[PDB]
């Protein structure tokens, strides 16, 4: 019995927490990511990189804490602990945002480990690896948003910060600087996520309300055996209901469940493509026809032109505090603003 | 056998290709009226003075809008919450200038969707089904009612209702963030949990069923042909799905009961959308998201900014530029 | 006013939801299919195809 | 050298439901991207 | 509006090419 086979035996044991070969890269990496985030949100400041308090220790709450992105001055430096910036000094590494690349890179390798775990368990149990394929959506989003967007930008500084309000800032920043709501790729992503929610709610409700009377109690949950060969709900009744309500209905359950994977996953992929565009400032920012017309015709207004104005206001009022390293001095008189307000 | 009885039997007939029902006798005229007026307005309606300051906004395709920028513009702020049917205008052109199509379309739409919910119950009753699909449908109904009816009522004007268009929707959201900090409202956070989780669970359930399909086909054909409409037998092995998922996380984090699983799948996004609908409905009365501006002070009393402060700067930027000509006084009270 | 209005709108909405829940359940239970579809006498199996 | 019949040819199929789904997809994709093509 | 003069050919082809692909495939199904 060779040592490799013995190791593969121990790693693939049936225990409370399956480990597998993937676990050697999923567990330490996920634990570094999670512990780094908890550590940073509890103890670490963004004072020297952003001019912001970002931990519980400084008084922020769950909504306002973050592992903030590193200072712009480092560009895309990987900010290794032993790297030329921190030079092995743990305190300096904390103060320069070194926890952001730590959480991002351990999280990326942890996500790789989780997908490898999906594949490994699928193979052991003997099923198709569609759960692993479904998870490619989340990885596409993580890679495009947390790695490729800042990689195309000036530095890790403009990557989203790992925090509730940090994420909200990133969202509003993409609105005001990139007009990200106007981006068709985001629109396809919105359609995918909303359609995924819709499909979840409508399948759940349909199944629960077409259940076969398989028991005597009002508690219909007890009327299902995991090993039973029979369908627990009427697909014919469901099909007729939706055909007469909505005009169309699923008639193939396999296609229904594939569609439930396809929609949100495809939406995440499409939004990721759009974000990759935004990494290079390739934005669907404007409709040039309407800009040319409004330039020439001062009576012409649409909701699009109004949103353009909103974005200009956001940019001018947010830039000095959001990008403190640029030393944006915008005197009050140059700040765009409507009447009175 | 009477003629009224014959009509009742036809209306409540389960053999009609599209079920009508009593709720349908209201749904069909209202939704048809709303669709006709919406398509005609979206294509051809003249500009609308939304902000009541005589600054008409072009919403229709023929006036220079594309599909993304086109909208049916909400009725004038001068109207406020006043009822504005066609017969209250001195001409159709005055009706159009003041955004009457918006009122017609929204009122008929709202009635139509409440009737759609009732119709879902009605057909379930006629089919001998359990009755709660309409309860799940009440979540999007609540959200639509929030943006088209409750928010205008609370703010005091149908001009504050969501525009019937894509860029109009973004304008609504941006203005809403600027005046209510919806991102920092916990009910919106539950709505985001509802939609992110609804997509997560849709992907999870779809992928687990698709992964655990019983072999029925050859490799040259779509696996979907392994299911036959109306078949007695289950098309995938829930036991295999549970073994995989309970090893992916831990045995007790996985469902072995399809009924319990399909309940969870229905309940999670539905509850999340109920919360977000109620969030929009309560910010209609200006009970806004969390305010943490200048919450952190140092010992001397100087403000240490947080991410909430930067978000507030973005909100102020949005707020000072919105409806740039509509405010005469310092505070945006509605 | 904000507290009272927001609170009672939310309670009114969730009580509309409760009305729908219990009204649909009361109807189904009176009719005898609140516990699910009987397999032998599933109504759709005796109804003609829509097309 | 002769031209022999290949045995690896398989029929291709697109059912009517797939036709409708694909046509709706193409239609809505056009609806989405037309405004950006015109710019 | 000063639109992209290539927008109309692009939109027409963007829709018509996959449309004809789909129609060809559907009409020949069953041969």
């Amino acid at each position: 019995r060779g040592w490799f086979d013995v190791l593969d035996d121990w790693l693939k044991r049936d225990r409370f927490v399956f480990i597998g070969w993937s676990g050697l890269l999923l567990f330490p990496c996920a634990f570094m990511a999670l512990g780094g985030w908890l550590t940073g949100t509890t103890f670490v400041t963004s004072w020297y990189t952003h001019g912001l308090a970002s931990s519980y220790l400084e008084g922020a709450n769950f909504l306002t804490v973050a592992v903030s992105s590193p200072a712009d001055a480092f560009g895309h430096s990987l900010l290794f602990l032993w790297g030329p910036e921190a030079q092995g000094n743990l305190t300096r590494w904390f103060q320069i945002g070194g926890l952001w690349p730590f959480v991002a890179l351990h999280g990326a390798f942890g996500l790789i480990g989780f997908m490898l775990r999906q594949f490994e368990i699928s193979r052991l149990v003997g099923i198709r690896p569609y759960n692993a394929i479904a998870f490619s959506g989340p990885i596409a989003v993580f890679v495009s948003v947390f790695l490729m967007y800042p990689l195309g930008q000036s530095s890790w500084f403009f990557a989203p910060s790992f925090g509730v309000a940090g994420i909200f800032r990133f969202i509003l920043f993409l609105q005001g600087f990139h007009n990200w709501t106007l981006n068709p790729f985001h629109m396809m992503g919105v359609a995918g996520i909303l359609g995924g929610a819709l499909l979840c709610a409508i399948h759940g409700a349909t199944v629960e309300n077409t259940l076969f009377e398989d028991g005597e109690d009002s508690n219909t949950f007890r009327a299902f055996e995991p090993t039973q060969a029979e369908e627990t709900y009427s697909m014919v009744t469901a099909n007729r209901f939706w055909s007469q309500i909505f005009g169309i209905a699923f008639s193939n359950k396999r296609w229904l469940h594939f569609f439930m994977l396809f929609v949100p996953v495809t939406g995440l992929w499409m939004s990721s493509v759009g974000i990759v565009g935004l990494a290079l400032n390739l934005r669907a920012y404007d409709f040039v026809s309407q800009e040319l017309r409004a330039a020439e015709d001062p009576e012409f207004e649409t909701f699009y032109t109004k949103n353009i104005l909103l974005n200009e206001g956001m940019r001018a009022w947010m830039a000095p505090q959001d990008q403190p390293h640029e030393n944006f001095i915008f005197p009050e008189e140059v700040l765009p603003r409507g009447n009175a307000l | 056998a009477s003629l009224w009885e014959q009509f009742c039997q036809w209306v409540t007939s389960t053999n009609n290709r599209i079920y009508v029902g009593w709720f349908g006798t209201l749904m069909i005229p209202t939704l048809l009226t709303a669709t006709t007026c919406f398509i005609i307005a979206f294509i051809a309606a003249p500009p609308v003075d939304i902000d009541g300051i005589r600054e008409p906004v072009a919403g229709s395709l023929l006036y220079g809008n594309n599909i993304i920028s086109g909208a049916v513009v909400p009725s004038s702020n001068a109207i406020g919450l006043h009822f504005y049917p066609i017969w209250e205008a001195a001409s159709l052109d005055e009706w159009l200038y003041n955004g009457g199509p918006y009122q017609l379309v929204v009122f008929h739409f709202l009635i139509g969707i409440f009737c759609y919910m009732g119709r879902q119950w009605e057909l379930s009753y006629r089919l001998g089904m359990r009755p709660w699909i309409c309860v799940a449908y009440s979540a999007p109904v609540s959200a639509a009612t929030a943006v088209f009816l409750i928010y205008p009522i609370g703010q005091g004007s149908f001009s504050d209702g969501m525009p019937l268009g894509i860029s109009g929707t973004f304008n609504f959201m941006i203005n809403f963030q600027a005046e209510h900090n919806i991102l920092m409202h916990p009910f919106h956070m539950l709505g985001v949990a509802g939609v992110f989780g609804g997509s997560l669970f849709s992907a999870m359930h779809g992928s687990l069923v698709t992964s655990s399909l019983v072999r029925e086909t050859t490799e040259v054909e779509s696996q979907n042909y392994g299911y036959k409409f109306g078949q007695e037998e289950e098309t995938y092995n829930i036991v295999a799905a549970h073994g995989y998922f309970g090893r992916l996380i831990f045995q007790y984090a996985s469902f072995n009961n399809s009924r319990s699983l399909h309940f969870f799948l229905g309940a999670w996004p539905v509850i999340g959308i109920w919360f977000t609908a109620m969030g929009v409905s309560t910010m209609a009365f200006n009970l806004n998201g969390f305010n943490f501006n200048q919450s952190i002070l140092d010992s001397q009393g100087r403000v240490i900014g947080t991410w909430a402060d930067v978000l507030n700067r973005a909100n102020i930027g949005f707020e000072v530029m919105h409806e740039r000509n509509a405010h005469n006084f310092p505070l945006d009270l509605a | 006013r904000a507290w009272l209005a927001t609170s009672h709108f939310v309670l009114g909405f969730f009580f509309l939801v409760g009305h729908l829940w219990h009204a649909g359940r009361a109807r189904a239970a009176a009719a005898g299919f609140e516990k699910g579809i009987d397999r032998e006498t599933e109504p759709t199996l005796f109804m003609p195809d829509l097309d | 050298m002769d031209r022999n019949s290949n045995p690896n040819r398989q029929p291709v199929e697109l059912n009517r439901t797939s036709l409708y789904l694909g046509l709706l997809l193409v239609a809505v994709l056009g609806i989405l991207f037309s405004s950006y093509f015109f710019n | 509006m000063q639109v992209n003069n290539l927008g109309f050919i692009a939109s027409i082809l963007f829709v018509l090419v996959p449309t004809v692909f789909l129609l060809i495939l559907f009409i020949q199904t069953g041969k």
Binding site: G247 | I43, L61, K228 | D49, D51 | G30 | -
Partner: peptide
């Protein structure tokens, strides 16, 4: 004339809806 393009793609979508409902593959119990 971009208006013609927009109306045409919207009309294609709506007509597809009509045909998909009125002329769908009839679900049959086999």
């Amino acid at each position: 004339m971009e208006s013609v393009a927009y109306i045409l793609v919207l009309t294609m979508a709506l007509a597809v809806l009509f045909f998909a409902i009125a002329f769908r593959e009839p679900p049959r119990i086999e």
